[PDB]
Every structure is written in C-alpha cells, then in structure tokens.
C-alpha cells in the first residue's frame, strides 16, 4: 500500500459522502440508515471509478 495515499482518498471520500448521507445534525449519533448509506456510498464510488477507467481504455 501507500500510508500517505491511504489517508488522502479517505478524506476526499468522506467529504463527498458525508454531504450526501448526513442530511442533518440533531444528535451526535449516526443512525442505522446513515451508517449503511456511508459504506454503500464509498463502494458505489469505487465501482464507478473502475467502470470509468475500464471504459476509457476499451473505448
């Protein structure tokens, strides 16, 4: 791996996904719903990257 880059991406993903999944701050606890949205969001984002990069070669 690369310790430095491992952090890098996590910051960016967190920044994108937090906006999209944390709709409001009323308690300090993450709900069931917003925790799963958060991990789906990251995965779905990675899936997109691969789809895009694969697609940029073939085509």
């Amino acid at each position: 791996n690369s310790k430095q880059k491992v952090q890098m991406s996590i910051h960016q993903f967190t920044n994108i996904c937090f906006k999209k999944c944390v709709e409001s701050v009323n308690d300090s606890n993450l709900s069931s719903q917003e925790e799963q949205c958060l991990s789906n969001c990251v995965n779905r984002f990675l899936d997109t990257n691969i789809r895009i990069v694969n697609g940029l070669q073939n085509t």
């Binding site: 994108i16 999944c21 779905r44 984002f45 990257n49 789809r51 895009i52 990069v53």
Partner: protein, 52 residues
C-alpha cells in the same frame, strides 16, 4: 489526464445514483461517460475556434 477520471466519476455519481446508494446502476454510468466525452469534444472545439 487522471484527475479527469475523478471528475467524471463525481458528475456521473451525482446523476445516476441516490441515497442510500444500495442499487448499482452501470447502464446509466456508461451512458453518462459517453455523454461526458461528447461534451468534452464540443467544448474543446468551441474553445479552440475562439483562440482564432
């Protein structure tokens, strides 16, 4: 050339997927990619025709 990848990803993520992001939807991404590259071409054309 490689940051590009991230911007398309963002743009296409916003238009093809929604909270809670359960269902993967690759038909929409492919289209969105295609549509994106066509947009790029049109903009570069418009842009260059402007730098005489």
């Amino acid at each position: 050339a490689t940051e590009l990848v991230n911007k398309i990803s963002e743009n296409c993520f916003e238009k093809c997927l929604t909270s809670p992001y359960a269902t993967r939807n690759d038909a929409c991404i492919d289209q969105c990619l295609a549509k994106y590259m066509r947009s790029w071409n049109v903009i570069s054309k418009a842009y260059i025709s402007r730098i005489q």
